Design a protein around this ligand. Structure first.
Ligand SMILES: CNC(=O)c1cc(C(=O)NC2CC2)n(Cc2ccccc2)n1
Length: 111
């Protein structure tokens, strides 16, 4: 079950990183460089940064023991975006679209 469910998670992760979703996935590829972007309040508002490169490293290192732990990091990434940004910002529209991809495929988890 656990290996099988984590392979489903790895499949989802590969899809989120694939060219298919690149138009709206790209802000989530790497850690937010707050200083580079002039977001000098980012790390005061976001206590637990998360991004797909960190999720990929954790998957590669067999850090995730189950699908629930993987999903918590993916949703933390989206939640950080919804917490920090005005809700009408382009990056929030991009987060909503990538979260739709994630949630619909995560829901197809093998039992
Ligand atoms: C996960 N990334 C973020 O939460 C984030 C927040 C921001 C940003 O500049 N937000 C403004 C309101 C202060 N940016 C830069 C960006 C990405 C896409 C399109 C335009 C700007 N990425």
């Amino acid at each position: 079950k656990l290996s099988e469910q984590l392979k489903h998670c790895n499949g989802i992760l590969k899809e989120l990183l694939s060219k298919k979703h690149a138009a709206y996935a790209w802000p989530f590829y790497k850690p937010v460089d707050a200083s580079a972007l002039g977001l000098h309040d980012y790390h005061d508002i976001i206590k637990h940064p998360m991004d797909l490169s960190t999720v990929k490293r954790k998957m590669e290192n067999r850090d995730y023991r189950d699908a629930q732990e993987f999903a918590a990091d993916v949703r933390l990434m989206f939640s950080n975006c919804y917490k920090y940004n005005p809700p009408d910002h382009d990056v929030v529209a991009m987060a909503r679209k990538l979260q739709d991809v994630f949630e619909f495929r995560y829901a197809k988890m093998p039992d």
